[PDB]
Amino acid sequence: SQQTRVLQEKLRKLKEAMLCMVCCEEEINSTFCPCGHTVCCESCAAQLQSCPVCRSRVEHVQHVYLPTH
């Protein structure tokens, strides 16, 4: 039904939001510290000196284990 389509859309948007903002191919699993933006996969996060969202200096990258992984 049209309801099935609406639910398909919500699921797709949630899935897209889980992907890395830099490569768009891998699941997010890293956090920039101390700002806390959690927007990249480990490979893309490892290469950044500053946060791609807020420009704060990245002191370190913390790997995150999320229940949605």
Ligand X SMILES: Cc1csc(NC[C@@H]2CCCO2)n1
Footprint of a second copy (CB under 8 A): 1, 3-4, 7-8, 10-11, 14, 17-18, 21, 28, 31, 33-39, 53, 62-68
Write out the binding residues for ligand X, residues 50-69 only, by CB under 6 A: 66-69
Q: Give the closest residue to 45 by CA, choosing from 61, 23, 33.
A: 61
CA-to-CA separations, 33 to 9, 17, 18, 41, 59, in angstroms, rounded = 32, 20, 19, 14, 6
Cβ distance to ligand X smaller for residue 1 or 21? 21
Q: 27 touches which of a second copy, ligand X, Zn ion, none (CB within 5 to 8 A by kind)?
A: ligand X
